[model samples]
Target: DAEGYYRVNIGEVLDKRYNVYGYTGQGVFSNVVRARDNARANQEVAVKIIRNNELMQKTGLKELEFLKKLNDADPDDKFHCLRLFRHFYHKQHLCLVFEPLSMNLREVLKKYGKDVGLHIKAVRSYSQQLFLALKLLKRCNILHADIKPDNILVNESKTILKLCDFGSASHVADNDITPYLVSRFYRAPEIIIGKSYDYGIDMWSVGCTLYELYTGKILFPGKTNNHMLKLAMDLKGKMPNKMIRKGVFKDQHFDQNLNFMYIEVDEREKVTVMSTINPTKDLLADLIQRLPEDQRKKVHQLKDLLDQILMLDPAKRISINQALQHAFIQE
Candidate 1:
């Protein structure tokens, strides 16, 4: 061990063994620094030191619980997921060791906007990887509640994508009951209506992510639940009568006594729906235009898939396995 205090540099030896490198990146809860292994000489690694503030302490506990389950549930040969090396506490900061990687998808997009066309190849590759990851997560009975550009990291080659950040992940058994567990924009409609959901929710988010990558913007960026419901109705037209008859829309806000323009509920609780005069045709057309020619060919199928997953009726939504077999993926 070094006796005197000294500033750490990229090539400078630290603790008489590890070589200290420059900072790699930082997030709300942790800071990642690039470092080299003195024993191996050339191998690089990321050392993520968690800040010990009140916010991080709370998040850290949740992360630890999630990681513990993931490690136990994870079988070998799953390299698409992030690898956790070891963790330690130094100077009152919790440090986690990991492999070093390049920027995330969000950072790359911010640096080089949509002007880069061939980058679609990279995005497509990642989409496939994410699909596989979701399949694996479902098989293991895990749900990654959060799936966004920032959570997907680009490896050194930029061809491979790794899923990171498990702070919001949870394990659900057949009997376990829980409400919605995803970001607002990426949330499935059933979740918005306070339905108990499962792994299928992640598939809805994946669809949204695919749309965002093609258009460079969110498909449905709703801030409130009511706004999201209104947007869903506007784009996909009114809810089906089957959904209302199922008692899914029995809340006071949606009672038959209320007068509405796009939807009408009778005393018997049967819903009469009318299509919007000028629906969100422009937005839908713009989204279809942004997709690649091959992907655009499956626009109708994709739209139908989105409608099913975004349906006011939770029972009508498509499952993750069904989504994986969608025409868009085939394209």
Candidate 2:
């Protein structure tokens, strides 16, 4: 509460509309609570209370504008993007109202995947819905910036899914090229390599998200950015020297000759070592191989889709419309 977060209390009516009833969750930018809409015939809604501060409030206003534009463009909200019911300021904190949703994909996987993965059919359904969301974002000229399991929320029936949380999102023209834009697990290779990225960054995230959905594990589980680059190269081969030469942070992980110069760390052993790396076969093939025979065809299609989306260069990554038309998506 002291950190500028609204201390939501049960039975509190925010803005004389939303009657706060249950706490949903919290993120770095805001806290969410389930509430009853008094003016909307008592329909349940999720209220996101933005942290009270200059920077967050400014970010919230920008997100609100983007949401309004996105919602207006898709009047029926058919694209699986989160719908904004209304917004207002409460005690100086900008509050966003949304249709209440069920557990995120991460929670669903924990309950049903059993550390293995979801049924291939279920993963396909979720992936298609996410692609639709991406399509809508692309049409609006916006970049979600953050696309991971935690941001993909399911409905009460668990059949319908919606993309939530636009806190880190921004227009492509407003892109500042932050190296740490997406979450570490789903971070695009371009971002790590310090390349000027585009919406393809979001596509990269979708690939990582879908892979995790099917395997119940992070595709590149790196402990740090240096290790992350190593993992990316391990799976996708080396970055193009032409691209590496333009990286603003290249010196941190590479030599003047464009060779990968890794300063490996072992926290448990409290030691560090300088070394070159050995080439390893891509991990995706092994991951797909472990699936049951019944899922073989679908997994192969997924592998093809991931290969397209996970291109090392953002310019070469699959477009949202093309991704939607992919064989795996059709399947």
Q: Please name the candidate that would achieve the greatest lDDT relative to the true structure.
A: 2
C-alpha positional error of residue 41 in candidate 2 after TM-score superposition, expressed in Å: 2.4
For 1-331, candidate 2 gives per-residue lDDT tens digits of: 5678887789999988889888887665688899998998999999888888887888888889888888999997789988998888898899999988987888888986555877788888888888899889989999998899888999998989998888789888786756777888788877877878778888888988998888888888888877787777776777878888877888777777678865554564332333444548564565563646668888888888888887788877788778778888685
The root-mean-square deviation over C-alpha atoms between each candidate and the true structure, in angstroms, is 7.2, 2.5
Where is the poorest 10-residue window by lDDT in model 1? Answer: 1-10
- Alpha carbon lDDT of each predicted model: 0.61, 0.82
For residues 245-292, what per-residue lDDT tens digits would candidate 1 score against the true structure? 333433522446432233333565444433332356344565543656
After superposition, which runs of candidate 1 have C-alpha atoms over 4 Å from their true positions?
Answer: 1-20, 53-55, 68-79, 114-120, 173-181, 239-284, 288-314
Off by over 4 Å in 2: 266-294
TM-scores for all candidates? Answer: 0.73, 0.92
